[PDB]
């Protein structure tokens, strides 16, 4: 697990010299925008139940075979497992968003997750769909301009989109 700064440092170390002025400008700009980044991570953290309820409702509307006898979210145990997985993946996406890098998400969360779901008999495409729906709800909450100073945050929205899309692509 490394952030944007440790990523830059590792790339510099591989070639084996100091961080260039362009690299330091990039990282200083990142730290300057880190306040907006904190706002985005707070948006994901305070609205997790809303995001995951919305995603689950949409997912079991589109895919009814999941919540009906025989389905992979049928009894309370597997339904709870599904909502738990949604919580987990949202959590790691917010971690990566704070880090400014997707190393925590990939290394700690999504690495053996497709293998786990394949061994359990869980539709990885349904899981990816759930992550997409959860991305959409999360993006609704991130853009919220209430309680927070107004300003451009398009880079943050795009970055959160890449984190969710990477999660989906890794699962499916």
């Amino acid at each position: 697990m490394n952030d944007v700064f440790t990523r830059a440092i590792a790339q510099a170390d591989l070639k084996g010299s100091f961080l260039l002025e362009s690299d330091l400008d990039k990282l200083a700009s990142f730290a300057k925008e880190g306040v907006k980044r904190l706002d985005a991570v707070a948006a994901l953290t305070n609205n997790a139940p809303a995001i995951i309820s919305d995603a689950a409702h949409k997912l079991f509307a589109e895919q009814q075979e999941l919540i009906q006898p025989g389905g992979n979210a049928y009894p309370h145990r597997r339904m709870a497992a599904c909502l738990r997985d949604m919580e987990i993946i949202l959590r790691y996406v917010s971690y990566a968003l704070l880090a400014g890098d997707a190393s925590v998400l990939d290394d700690r969360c999504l690495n053996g997750l497709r293998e786990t779901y394949n061994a359990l008999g869980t539709p990885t495409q349904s899981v990816a769909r759930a992550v997409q729906l959860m991305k959409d709800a999360a993006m609704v909450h991130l853009k919220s301009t209430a309680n927070v100073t107004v300003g451009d945050c398009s880079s943050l929205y795009s970055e959160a989109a890449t984190y969710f899309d990477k999660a989906a692509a890794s699962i499916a």
Partner: protein
């Protein structure tokens, strides 16, 4: 009516539908993916070690059977699933456990330091294999990171074997999950607060089934199986043993997956994906937004709201303000109303300062006459007569007075006959009073509003030609009804009125048939 089916089949249908709540509905169908609740752990063969075997806990006081079962579980977990012979059984350690000198944790520490554990999992192994085994048997999980292997290899190299075993058993993870009293169990088969994506797969790789074991007596030896995958940060293998292939064969987890077509569809003429793009636009997305955006597509008619009024040249004549002049009014309101009145009632023709009626304006200023009475005076004036009466035919005067005083064109030839007769028998003034005292004039203009062009909108009772006739009477905003044109002041609507139309309608009806 005779019975259509035999009663046995009716009974069978009734009792099939009786075992459903709601019988047979579309909402209460079984899932096509026919997975029991225990589908996953049964097909993986981990049902016993993950859900069925209880967590064995031993406290300070206990009976004989509790002690013996605890010992059986301990030996079946810590020593892998390998047969420990009676000569190998540790007696003093379990006497200390029985006394209460050591906890179950202390017993695990002793056993992992014993020659049984070392002979099985240390002396004929790599250190990688030893660390895998010790994570599995002592921490109930598999190593997550290569840093763990580096840490444990360095710890054994510097401080020895027992420091390694203590790092396992004294770890906060071991005490969080097992404390001092419950035997360690495989614990990454259920999600816990500190798990990682690779953990499930790697534990599955390390676990060889209930009848499998971690024995050095394999002909290939005691070999590491996670040494290459932990280094490369890969998941573990999820291939399960061969006796589980018959388990839950009829489940269809990959139900949503689409079967490919035998041949990709092409569109030879306009390119080779318009069918694929059409199918992605048809089914891949929900119907609601599909219709929503189809509704708001621009039309092939590129027609603004003023389109149609611009074509006939009547946008201004339609949108100009309606001047209403009350009894009390200011100078600006009065002069603007005068301007509007002279522009309409004199047909956009220039009236010089000498021709303007001062006495009539004064009477209107005082309130002696209304706007209607002013209009009546104006239309009786030599200005109006000389422009619209004296150098004209009566047809032109009648269409022109309709246009100027009613804001509409004649609707039929009966109006022409009526007005010609009225003027011929009573004179010009009576004929003007016919327009100004008409119910139409009072219902639309009514004593206070300047006349405006009414016939660009549908009027009740209109003849479907009065619109066309007002268009043919109107010459745009900069057109006038002057008598100073080269030919003179000549009629416009004589043939259309008398005929009642163009005379091409029967042939239009023919044309709308065959050809």
């Amino acid at each position: 009516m005779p019975a259509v089916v035999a009663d046995q089949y009716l009974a069978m249908a009734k009792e099939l539908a009786a075992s459903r709540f709601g019988g047979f509905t579309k909402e209460n169908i079984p899932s096509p993916m026919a997975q029991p609740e225990s589908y996953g752990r049964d097909r993986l063969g981990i049902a016993a070690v993950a859900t069925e075997n209880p967590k064995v806990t031993l406290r300070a006081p206990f009976t004989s059977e509790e002690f013996q079962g605890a010992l059986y579980a301990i030996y079946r977990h810590i020593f892998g699933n390998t047969y420990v012979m009676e000569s190998e059984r540790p007696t003093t350690a379990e006497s200390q456990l029985k006394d209460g000198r050591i906890t179950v944790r202390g017993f695990i520490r002793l056993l992992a330091k014993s020659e049984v554990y070392k002979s099985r999992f240390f002396q004929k192994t790599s250190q990688n294999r030893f660390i895998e085994l010790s994570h599995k048997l002592l921490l109930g999980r598999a190593p997550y990171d290569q840093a763990e292997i580096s840490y444990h290899l360095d710890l054994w190299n510097t401080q020895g074997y027992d420091a390694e075993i203590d790092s396992y058993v004294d770890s906060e993870e071991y005490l969080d999950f097992f404390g001092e009293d419950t035997v360690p169990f495989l614990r990454d088969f259920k999600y816990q607060t500190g798990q990682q994506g690779v953990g499930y797969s790697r534990l599955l790789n390390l676990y060889d089934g209930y009848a499998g074991s971690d024995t050095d007596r394999a002909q290939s030896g005691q070999k590491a199986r996670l040494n290459g995958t932990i280094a490369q940060a890969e998941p573990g293998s999820i291939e399960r043993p061969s006796a589980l292939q018959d388990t839950w064969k009829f489940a269809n987890p990959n139900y949503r997956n689409a079967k490919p077509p035998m041949v990709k569809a092409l569109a030879l003429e306009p390119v080779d994906l318009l069918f694929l793009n059409m199918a992605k636009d048809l089914t891949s997305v929900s119907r609601a937004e599909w219709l929503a955006k189809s509704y708001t597509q621009p039309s092939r008619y590129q027609q603004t709201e003023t389109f149609g009024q611009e074509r006939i040249g009547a946008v201004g004549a339609i949108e100009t303000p309606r001047i209403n002049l009350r009894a009390p009014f200011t100078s600006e309101e009065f002069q603007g109303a005068l301007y509007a009145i002279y522009r309409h009632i004199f047909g956009n023709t220039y009236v010089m300062e000498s021709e303007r009626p001062t006495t009539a304006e004064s009477q209107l200023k005082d309130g002696r006459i209304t706007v209607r009475g002013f209009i009546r005076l104006l239309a009786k004036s030599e200005v109006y007569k000389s422009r619209f009466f004296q150098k004209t035919s009566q047809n032109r005067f009648i269409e022109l007075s309709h246009k100027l005083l009613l804001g509409r064109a004649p609707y039929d030839q009966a109006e022409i006959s009526y007005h010609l007769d009225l003027w011929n028998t009573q004179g010009y003034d009576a004929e003007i009073d016919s327009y100004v005292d008409s119910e139409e004039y009072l219902d639309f203009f009514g004593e206070d509003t300047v006349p405006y062009f009414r016939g660009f909108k549908y009027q009740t009772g209109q003849s479907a030609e009065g619109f066309n006739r007002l268009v043919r009477l109107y010459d745009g905003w900069a057109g006038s009804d002057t008598d100073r044109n080269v030919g003179g002041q000549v009629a416009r609507l004589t043939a259309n009125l008398t005929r009642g139309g163009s005379g091409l309608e029967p042939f239009i009806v023919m044309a709308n048939s065959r050809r």
